[PDB]
């Protein structure tokens, strides 16, 4: 039973002996075997008393579980409930990850489940490597470990061992002729993972055992990966390989100098200038066979600086912080290319720093460039548009002015991203559709914020018609959230999530200007929620009528004269007057309610339960339907 399962789980949590013996004996020995072979949802997480004894580290409970009872070690569970949130574990995984050598020792001894394949086909050797303790890995290798497995992330145990801060496991793996040249999911050979967090000893060990230098899926050598992450030590080690070439040496030095310019943990502008100058002097040293820089055409986002192909201009921009920052951005874009994953984040950081210094024009420029790069790479920018809505709120709450082409570009990108978010939601049925739907709703909210700023600025005729074109393009896609709210239900809803950051001030919902903009940009005013409420059943439920009359009045005016049918019944068969938790909303609606005999006759047909099917016009069947 579930109650006795919880009882024995609690007994195993404290690691007791007599309580576990009494609670797992005599009474229904078949059910006792079932309980020791059962997994339950405790604390919202799937776990087993045996696997939690392997987790808690209490010895005697697991000794008497594996000795006084014949319990299998193949019981299901969760490999990690923080950062991984995936099930399918075994006792070996939780024993190794927690860090108990003796527990996993007598767990493998009482049943060798070393080749355990979960839902993500990851063996407990991953837990052994992630724990970092050498003894568990030593024993699991002594149990004839098959070191060839790739996870759902397609990473060998060597890759995760090198990515973590543990080098003893890496040394033990390479000491028995492991695979330091084998490829991971994209391109990683554990060098791209050792040269990501700054583990110089792991890189040294892999280089000593000939891990080789090969580009990854993004064309990034481990030297270039280390240079990208501001790892000066790893770049120093990898620049001495007996085959590095001048072009790669100077591009790694330039990338390191550029990376030092725009970063948070490692932000040094003196190191930026010095590494850029060191790579410049290395270019211009011989005169004969002089190495010349492949200067890209100027980019409007980084001011108008066309790189620095001479030491004179580089020395000129030595003392200029902004020039050095944009030079680092240009060098990163040139070396990495405008398609890398890591080429966009420094641009966003420089934009954020500029925004924090009340500098907004080049902030918008840099963030728009990063947004364009991430859209061309087809990546989730539901946070970048939120950052745009927050900075646009900052440019409005501080009484500044916002350029209309900026809002137009952000709105076009938001419309696009909502379109591919709909594509992602509809393409993936149920595999991870929850996060995709949440991103979709967040992106709709960011669009509504952007429309809210668009209503609170001044625009020319061409800019205003472009903005209205983007709003029309979105509103004709019928964007519905998970509860059914169209893009206008949210604009009239009090319970619309506004971000707690700077959008909480400028962007207030319900909005009388956003609603009118959506209405005259072609929004279906008679749109229906999944609950059944129309766009009017929501505004007349507004709980701040007298305080916010101007918003409440102008929305109800806008909807009714924009075509709202002020008699619709939701799936609970309630008119907007019936679903009006406010006397003022009732007064306003009754002022705007235009009576018709079709509405009264449909109300009498619905209320009297008259069978109208196949006795009325087909177009009128819907009319009786929403009455």
């Amino acid at each position: 039973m579930e109650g006795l399962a919880g009882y024995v789980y609690k007994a195993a949590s404290e690691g007791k002996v007599l309580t576990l013996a009494a609670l797992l004996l005599n009474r229904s020995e078949s059910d006792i075997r079932y309980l020791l072979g059962y997994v339950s949802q405790q604390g919202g997480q799937r776990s087993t008393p045996l696997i939690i004894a392997a987790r808690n580290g209490h010895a005697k409970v697991v000794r008497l579980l594996l000795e006084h009872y014949r319990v299998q070690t193949q019981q299901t569970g969760t490999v990690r409930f923080d950062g991984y949130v995936i099930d399918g574990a075994t006792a070996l995984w939780c024993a190794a990850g927690a860090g108990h050598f003796e527990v996993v020792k007598l767990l493998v001894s009482h049943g060798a489940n070393v080749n355990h394949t979960t839902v993500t086909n990851s063996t407990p050797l991953r837990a052994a490597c992630f724990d970092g303790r050498l003894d568990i890995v030593k024993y699991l290798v002594e149990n004839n470990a098959n070191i060839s497995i790739a996870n759902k992330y397609d990473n060998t145990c060597l890759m995760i061992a090198a990515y973590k801060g543990h080098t003893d496991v890496v040394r033990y793996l390479l000491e028995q002729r492991a695979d330091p040249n084998a490829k991971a999911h994209c391109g990683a050979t554990a060098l791209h993972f050792a040269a990501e967090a700054g583990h110089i000893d792991i890189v040294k060990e892999l280089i000593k055992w000939r891990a080789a230098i090969v580009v990854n899926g993004h064309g990034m050598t481990p030297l270039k990966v280390a240079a990208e992450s501001c790892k000066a030590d790893v770049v120093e080690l990898l620049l001495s390989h007996a085959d590095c070439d001048r072009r790669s040496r100077i591009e790694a030095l330039e990338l390191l100098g550029a990376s030092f310019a725009n970063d948070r943990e490692n932000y040094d502008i003196i190191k930026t200038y010095h590494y850029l100058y060191l790579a410049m002097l290395e270019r211009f040293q011989d005169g004969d066979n002089i190495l010349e820089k492949e200067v890209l055409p100027p980019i409007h986002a980084y001011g108008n600086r066309t790189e620095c192909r001479n030491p004179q201009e580089l020395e000129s921009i030595r003392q200029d912080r902004d020039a050095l920052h944009m030079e680092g951005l240009i060098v990163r874009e040139r070396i990495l290319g405008a398609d890398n994953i890591d080429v966009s984040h420094p641009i966003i950081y420089r934009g954020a720093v500029y925004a924090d210094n009340m500098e907004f024009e080049q902030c918008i420029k840099l963030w728009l460039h990063a947004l364009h790069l991430r859209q061309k790479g087809n990546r989730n920018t539901h946070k970048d548009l939120l950052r745009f809505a927050q900075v646009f709120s900052q440019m409005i709450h501080l009484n500044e002015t916002v350029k209309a082409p900026d809002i137009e570009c952000v709105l076009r990108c938001s419309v696009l991203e909502i379109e591919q978010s709909m594509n992602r939601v509809k393409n993936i049925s149920d595999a991870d559709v929850h996060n995709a739907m949440d991103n979709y709703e967040c992106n709709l909210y960011t669009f509504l914020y952007l429309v809210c700023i668009s209503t609170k600025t001044q625009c020319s005729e061409e800019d205003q018609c472009k903005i209205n074109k983007q709003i029309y393009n979105l509103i004709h896609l019928d964007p519905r959230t998970r509860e059914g709210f169209t893009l206008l239900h949210l604009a009239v809803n009090s319970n619309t999530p506004v971000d707690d950051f700077h959008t909480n001030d400028v962007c207030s919902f319900p909005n009388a200007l956003v609603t009118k903009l959506l209405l005259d940009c072609g929004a279906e005013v008679n749109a229906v929620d999944n609950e059944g409420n129309s766009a009017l059943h929501i505004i007349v439920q507004y709980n701040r009528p007298i305080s916010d009359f101007l918003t409440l009045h102008s929305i109800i005016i806008s909807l009714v004269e924009a075509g709202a049918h002020t008699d619709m019944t939701n799936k609970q068969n309630k008119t907007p007057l019936d679903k009006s938790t406010t006397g003022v909303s009732e007064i306003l609606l009754k002022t705007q309610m235009k009576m018709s005999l079709k509405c009264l006759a449909a109300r009498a047909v619905r209320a009297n339960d008259i069978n109208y099917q196949d006795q009325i016009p087909r177009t009128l069947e819907e009319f009786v339907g929403f009455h």
Binding site: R264, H345, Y349, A352, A355, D356, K383, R387, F501
Partner: peptide
């Protein structure tokens, strides 16, 4: 501050 919210994705 804007630069603080970037640490969520890093």
């Amino acid at each position: 501050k804007f630069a603080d919210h970037l640490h969520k994705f890093h």
